[PDB]
Amino acid sequence: DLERILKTIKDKNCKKVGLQFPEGLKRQAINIAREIEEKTRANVIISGNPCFGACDIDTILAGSVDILFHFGHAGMGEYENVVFIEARSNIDIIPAVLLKANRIGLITTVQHVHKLEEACKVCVIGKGDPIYPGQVLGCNFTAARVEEFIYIGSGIFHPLGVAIATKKRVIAADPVEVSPERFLRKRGGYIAKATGAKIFGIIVSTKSGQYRMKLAQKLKEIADKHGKIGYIILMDLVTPEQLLAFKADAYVNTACPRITIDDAERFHAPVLTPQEFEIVLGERRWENMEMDEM
Amino acid sequence: DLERILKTIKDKNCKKVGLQFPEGLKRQAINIAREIEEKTRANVIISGNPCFGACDIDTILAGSVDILFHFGHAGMGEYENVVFIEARSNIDIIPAVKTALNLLKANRIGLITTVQHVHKLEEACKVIKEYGKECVIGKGDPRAIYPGQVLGCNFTAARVDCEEFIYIGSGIFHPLGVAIATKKRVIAADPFLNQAVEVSPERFLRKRGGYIAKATGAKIFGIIVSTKSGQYRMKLAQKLKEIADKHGKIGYIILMDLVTPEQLLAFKADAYVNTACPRITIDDAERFHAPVLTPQEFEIVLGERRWENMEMDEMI
Ligand SMILES: C[S@@+](CC[C@H](N)C(=O)[O-])C[C@H]1O[C@@H](n2cnc3c(N)ncnc32)[C@H](O)[C@@H]1O
Ligand SMILES: C[S@@+](CC[C@H](N)C(=O)[O-])C[C@H]1O[C@@H](n2cnc3c(N)ncnc32)[C@H](O)[C@@H]1O
Ligand code: SF4
Ligand code: SF4
């Protein structure tokens, strides 16, 4: 893709250029900056912060350069001077493509979204929202709002999320039939532990696509409506170290919902999704359990 | 303390209040928020990021609240709605001063300290003069507000006419910097242990000499800039990138908030130049996986500064 970047800089005669990478790709940062500074007149600034997705735009860097190039993710939101360099996986998914139903849904991650159209020939792909048909995220299952499901990729969080959010069967094909019962007992365990919690830290992230302050204020009032207390804690990164310093009984995460699931055993008090918080408080019934979405 | 905060909230009729603590005081955050929300009508938001000092204001939070209370440090900069609740310690420092008087060899003495003892420096100065000596307290600047106050990144209070210094406080980084910055003898007097020692910059400079040597064969540098409110040095970084190119090397500017070993390891640079908090360079040296240099040590490595022309990295 490096030639589109060079052409975009020259054609826009960019003078200052920002680069932002997911963790998996910062190993390439210095080489890409080298190519740009050698083959253009632009000066490069690399973002040095962790970056977890298109929900995590370095907007400070973006407001300092003519164009910020953000790698590894499909776009999100609308910032005038951020270009998303997608970076797709070249692997073949047709080997991976147990079913029972006649209408079968395709869902995947951004790295394979270009390959759905022909996996479909081998069926209705689900259109998303503000990106691609069939794309799901840890925080967004719109593409699954379309009888059974085949997910394409690695990891089990995405198929689980689809299975919980639509209550349909999902086959997970890496390039496995997904059981959400193991995940729901787990989340049940955290709800039980937090049932006797009296004081809650309500986590809000300033990251560009993870900020949910209005929901946090709602959650604070719902806690007080039920004779408990939540204090809003505003931060950038959400980490077990930073939550240990505040002496709360339990936490409610309104930032990235995969923090809540992935890094669960790593936190030293219970960390809850908004919806599990409501169940702990008595505002929502356990049967009305849903995936945290943004 | 808490009475000042409550009064300020009621005098200024605040509805949204922010709290920011250094790491040692986040343990009190919830208790202080509770007190505020029970005794006022205000809603509290607590900053959850690391906070390293008054150089590290949570300006996103401050731009979201009527007033941000920032704890533990003396003020710095000029932020319209930030109130600094400083960390003042009540330990008697005069016994440490007396111990340090044993060690002096000159009659004209400078006094410096950290923020938690600046209110007692005038009393120390009186005792030192009562014991036959001349004594002076240097004025700070817009960064080190109080007379006699030094920071890891600011030794202006030490730029005074005196023969030797007494530093009052714990740790040895501050008197080391004063010793290196002034070329004068420094006695470090710790009021909590009541001991005085003569600081020696030799082990310090031998250590810094070791990192310059490792970075001397470096071809590619990451030049680190922090977006923190009082640590941002982009113009300097742009200068150092040009200076590297002038000398047949390459520096790439890397803009970040926290500067940590994990973040520096993700980039394939041979070495780094840190224009953020100078104490990162010193304290965390052994933890980084490539050499990290001060701006001035960078100039040595490149050929812009004699290797003995060694100065402390200061924020100014
Ligand atoms: C690795 S990304 C997942 C990839 C992709 N974003 C997706 O939609 O599935 C999710 C991980 O990023 C990290 N993460 C996301 N937002 C974070 C935040 N605000 N603070 C700290 N870690 C965060 C968490 O460790 C979480 O497990
Ligand atoms: C302990 S505080 C210093 C307290 C006081 N401000 C002073 O003048 O001495 C300095 C430490 O904070 C950490 N620190 C400061 N700024 C930082 C930054 N931008 N990123 C990561 N760590 C930082 C470094 O580890 C450094 O050792
Ligand atoms: S799952 Fe988390 S990291 Fe991925 S897009 Fe959603 S908020 Fe960002
Ligand atoms: S030494 Fe570092 S942490 Fe202390 S005031 Fe200076 S920049 Fe901030």
UniProtKB/TrEMBL annotation, chain B:
GO terms for biological process: protein histidyl modification to diphthamide. Its EC number is 2.5.1.108. [4Fe-4S] cluster binds at residues 55, 153, 277. One of its GO terms (molecular function) is metal ion binding. Keywords: 4Fe-4S, Iron, Iron-sulfur, Metal-binding, S-adenosyl-L-methionine, Transferase. The keyword Metal-binding applies. It comes from the Archaea. Gene3D superfamilies: Diphthamide synthesis DPH1/DPH2 domain 1, Diphthamide synthesis DPH1/DPH2 domain 2, Diphthamide synthesis DPH1/DPH2 domain 3. Pfam families: Diphthamide_syn. Catalyzes the first step of diphthamide biosynthesis, i.e. the transfer of the 3-amino-3-carboxypropyl group from S-adenosyl-L-methionine (SAM) to the C2 position of the imidazole ring of the target histidine residue in translation elongation factor 2 (EF-2). Belongs to the DPH1/DPH2 family. This is 2-(3-amino-3-carboxypropyl)histidine synthase. It comes from Candidatus Methanoperedens nitratireducens.
